[PDB]
Structure 1
Amino acid sequence: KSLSLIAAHSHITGLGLDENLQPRPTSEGMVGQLQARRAAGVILKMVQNGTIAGRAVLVAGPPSTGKTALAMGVSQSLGKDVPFTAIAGSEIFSLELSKTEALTQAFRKSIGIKIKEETELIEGEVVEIQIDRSITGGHKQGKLTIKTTDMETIYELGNKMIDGLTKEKVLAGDVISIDKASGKITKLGRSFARSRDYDAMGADTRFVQCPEGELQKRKTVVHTVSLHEIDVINSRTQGFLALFTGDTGEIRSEVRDQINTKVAEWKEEGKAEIVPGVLFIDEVHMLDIECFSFINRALEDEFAPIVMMATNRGVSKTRGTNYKSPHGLPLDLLDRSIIITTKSYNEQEIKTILSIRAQEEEVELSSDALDLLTKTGVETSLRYSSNLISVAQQIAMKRKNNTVEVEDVKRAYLLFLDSARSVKYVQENESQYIDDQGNVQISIAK
């Protein structure tokens, strides 16, 4: 599943580590950042333990150095059943929701709850359905014979079940399951039994299902929901539609505190399980000082998932102020957060990453082509080469050779411009563009 063509992080697969939390030099589609990997694994173990809440971790470093890569790696290594919410800085400035309300909604999104509902479900292949009318003797007549692989028996109606079965046009001889605690018919498919008469359905029922034999089965159902879903459901008459449309509109706080108390009650009763989800925010330097102030308090609550942040700049002006604060963040948050630093890459690491992208993008790279690509990447940037590799393919089989060579790389380099060369050309051709003061020289002559 998970339809996708190609992602900028399609190669990273859940970090790479040993049992001793030691990162291998090359594991699961990434190279380098040993200390950062070890710190990420430490945080992953924290999340697995689930005994700690409301911890702030910040990832810092130069741009294009495994920041979002590390975030995706920890997200993948986290696996299912642990909520993970990745949010950009600019997704909260909405005219429909207050900024603190949106941050609250995200925090409630990143809290996993496991519940177990027990229902007595009966399944098995049927032969026909008996639905009778009201007569003098009693309410109705009904005797369902149900067959399975092992043993076949008969049951009777329940007055309401005639209406339930007549709600839909149930064909005779299908595998339908009934939970008497709910009464919901689950027409999974037709009765397998013998497929000689059931060999040409014309698709349908997805190859039916082989009956399991025994019928009296009570299997627990595990359902995973987050606090946001519960409060949104409680808020309105039909909260699910609001959940699927996003018109919640500033949910009231007393509902939230009641939900907190009631889920605590369920946790003590053993009915519910709490999963410490993760909230991730990118380029948080785009946030406002009000958001930082709200975070400063929302962190200390017991229902506070581990929050990871990544920025690019350093010593910048925090939005909403006029002083160039260090790291582009308020100082108190820097005090309350733990900083993870990422360092610059090496030519060997960049060449390994380029080869990983090549094998990921079905790109066959010649050794000299790899050398030239690594030289270009170390000269300008990782992403420049990481895009030139993909673009040079089209040139490769525009000359009908599947494997790329040096000439295709040279053509791609001479066809698509680099930031340094582009800025040099722009500076040497300042009169040709639009100035910051609206000064344009359209006329070539005079």
Structure 2
Amino acid sequence: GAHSHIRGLGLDDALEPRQASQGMVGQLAARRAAGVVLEMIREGKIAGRAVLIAGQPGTGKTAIAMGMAQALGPDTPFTAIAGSEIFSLEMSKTEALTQAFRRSIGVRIKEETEIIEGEVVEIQIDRPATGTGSKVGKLTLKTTEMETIYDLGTKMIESLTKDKVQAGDVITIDKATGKISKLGRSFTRARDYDAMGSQTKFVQCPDGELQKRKEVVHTVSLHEIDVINSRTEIKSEVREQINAKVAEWREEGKAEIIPGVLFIDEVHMLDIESFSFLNRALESDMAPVLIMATNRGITRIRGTSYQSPHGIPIDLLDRLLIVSTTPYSEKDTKQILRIRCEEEDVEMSEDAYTVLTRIGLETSLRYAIQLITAASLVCRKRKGTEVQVDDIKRVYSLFLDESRSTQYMKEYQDAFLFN
């Protein structure tokens, strides 16, 4: 959720940054280049191309990544995993990369039917059904909130004629929200009491749907379908037959797949055998787009004995688009803070809004944020319900920055490791 606020690159139609759209601060040149890349994508020119972000650490360039993910579409799949996360004990590297890719592709699987859901005593005015339309009015049945004034659908009679008088009525009877009902495609029905069997003690729970309807996808990722079809390390025959399954699904037009975008960071964690997979993987039929982010300089490629910029093999480097920009200033950081502040739903004095940035701007964005909640708890303690400098600085008793965290504690180390 460290990027919930993000909504996209935030530029005009002429590829110019309105500097605050979508909730992204400053960082002009980066967003601009990212927009150019967005274009490149929308014309398939990124075929046999990828883009690498030469970031500065302690900043998590993921921001612009998520932004591009948004600006591509509403729900374009987007996964971000760490380069080091491929050396598992269980999964092979191939297994891991394949899982990532099949986790970067989605589908469109919607369907149709009609039946209500709800919970009320089995004395129903909709136990009969007039037909298509409201047939209820300001009908008032028992829910846990209040009575209702609403409209209903068509097929409500038979099911309640099917509904026997049960001890426990989370069954298709009525609606009592207050506003609106209908049938909808539920088919998620049985005859059952309104409770389950709990761990410590056992009590009753008055519950139940108010309504129910969905033209469903609710399963959208190539990787999702797989664990759907495994236990509640994946057998290939499952995958290919799933791929075989969808292979026709798409033909009818019933199903539609979209590319996504995948984001690795710390690419220098990989090795040649990993890259060799990618530049073969990417040139496939409909592979998603790829973005990478490092903060190392000239470096030895892992798995060999050679230097190369960022530790990337030349062949891959030639076919790349390199983007990079600056660490933050002050002004932005405050603005950056506010965003996360309001996202974290915290009462911060603009007085605090100085003592804190002067920490982060000196130390790092991704750490200062990491403190934000850590003050609310003493605000919960001091009853203060608001954060001036009063708190983080007070709990700067228990607070200190990265050099302080890393280095001065590395100096806490360098204190004693001297002996």
Same fold? TM cut 0.5: yes
CA change 1:333–1:205 in 2 (3 A) is same
CA change 1:208–1:59 in 2 (3 A) is closer
1:404 pairs with 2:388: yes
- The residue correspondences of 1:29-68 to structure 2 (distance < 5 A) are 29-44=23-38, 55-65=49-59, 67-68=61-62
1:341 pairs with 2:324: yes
Give the deviation of 1:32 after TM superposition.
1.3
RMSD: 5.0
Paired with 2:115 and 2:378, the residues of 1 have a C-alpha distance of 62
Aligned residue for 1:136?
none
Paired with 1:11 and 1:184, the residues of 2 have a C-alpha distance of 36
Paired with 2:383 and 2:40, the residues of 1 have a C-alpha distance of 53
Give the deviation of 1:313 after TM superposition.
0.9
* Number of residues of Structure 1 aligned to a counterpart in Structure 2: 373
**Structure 2 runs not aligned, ≥5 long:** 136-153, 175-181, 194-203
Contact 1:54 1:307 in 2 (8 A): no
Contact 1:174 1:189 in 2 (8 A): no
Give the deviation of 1:106 after TM superposition.
1.5
Aligned residue for 1:174?
173
Identity %: 50
Q: One-letter code of the match for 2:55?
A: G
Give the deviation of 1:327 after TM superposition.
0.9
**Structure 1 runs not aligned, ≥5 long:** 1-6, 129-143, 157-161, 191-200, 213-218, 234-238, 441-446
Paired with 2:251 and 2:78, the residues of 1 have a C-alpha distance of 25
1:72 pairs with 2:66: yes
Give the deviation of 1:277 after TM superposition.
1.8
Contact 1:58 1:340 in 2 (8 A): yes
- Higher Rg of the two aligned structures: 1
Contact 1:325 1:331 in 2 (8 A): yes
| TM-score computed with the length of structure 2 as normaliser | 0.68
Contact 2:375 2:391 in 1 (8 A): no
**Equivalent of 1:324 in 282, 303, 307:** 307
Contact 1:373 1:389 in 2 (8 A): no
**Equivalent of 1:226 in 202, 221, 230:** 221
Aligned residue for 1:241?
230
Give the deviation of 1:276 after TM superposition.
1.3
Give the deviation of 1:359 after TM superposition.
4.0
Q: One-letter code of the match for 2:229?
A: F
**Equivalent of 2:76 in 74, 82, 87:** 82
Aligned residue for 2:138?
none
Contact 1:56 1:336 in 2 (8 A): yes
Contact 2:69 2:76 in 1 (8 A): no
Contact 1:267 1:273 in 2 (8 A): yes
1:171-209 CA distance string (max 9 Å, x none)? 897379799xxx96745999xxxxxxxxxx984433468
Contact 2:8 2:22 in 1 (8 A): yes
- The residue correspondences of 1:26-425 to structure 2 (distance < 5 A) are 26-44=20-38, 55-65=49-59, 67-77=61-71, 80-117=74-111, 148=131, 149-150=134-135, 174=173, 186=189, 203-207=206-210, 225-230=220-225, 232=226, 240-242=229-231, 244=232, 247-249=233-235, 251-252=236-237, 256=240, 263=246, 266-361=249-344, 362-367=346-351, 369-383=352-366, 385-386=368-369, 398=382, 402-405=386-389, 409=393, 412=396, 416=400, 418-419=402-403, 423=407
Once the two structures are overlaid, the 10-residue window that deviates more, 332-341 or 411-420, is 411-420
Once the two structures are overlaid, the 10-residue window that deviates more, 68-77 or 42-51, is 42-51
Give the deviation of 1:337 after TM superposition.
2.4
**Equivalent of 1:23 in 13, 17, 26:** 17
CA change 1:223–1:53 in 2 (3 A) is farther
Contact 2:109 2:255 in 1 (8 A): yes
Give the deviation of 1:265 after TM superposition.
5.2
1:96-154 CA distance string (max 9 Å, x none)? 22201221121122122223556x657799xx9xxxxxxxxxxxxxxx97654557899
Q: One-letter code of the match for 2:234?
A: T
Give the deviation of 1:342 after TM superposition.
2.5
Aligned residue for 2:147?
none
Paired with 1:286 and 1:412, the residues of 2 have a C-alpha distance of 35
Give the deviation of 1:75 after TM superposition.
3.9
Give the deviation of 1:372 after TM superposition.
4.3
Paired with 1:16 and 1:72, the residues of 2 have a C-alpha distance of 12
Paired with 1:379 and 1:220, the residues of 2 have a C-alpha distance of 51
Give the deviation of 1:346 after TM superposition.
1.9
Paired with 1:291 and 1:352, the residues of 2 have a C-alpha distance of 39
Paired with 1:405 and 1:155, the residues of 2 have a C-alpha distance of 65
Once the two structures are overlaid, the 10-residue window that deviates more, 398-407 or 333-342, is 398-407
Paired with 1:388 and 1:58, the residues of 2 have a C-alpha distance of 30
Contact 2:117 2:210 in 1 (8 A): no
CA change 1:428–1:58 in 2 (3 A) is closer
Give the deviation of 1:275 after TM superposition.
1.0
Q: One-letter code of the match for 1:110?
A: S
Once the two structures are overlaid, the 10-residue window that deviates more, 293-302 or 82-91, is 82-91
Paired with 2:355 and 2:116, the residues of 1 have a C-alpha distance of 65
Paired with 2:216 and 2:340, the residues of 1 have a C-alpha distance of 42
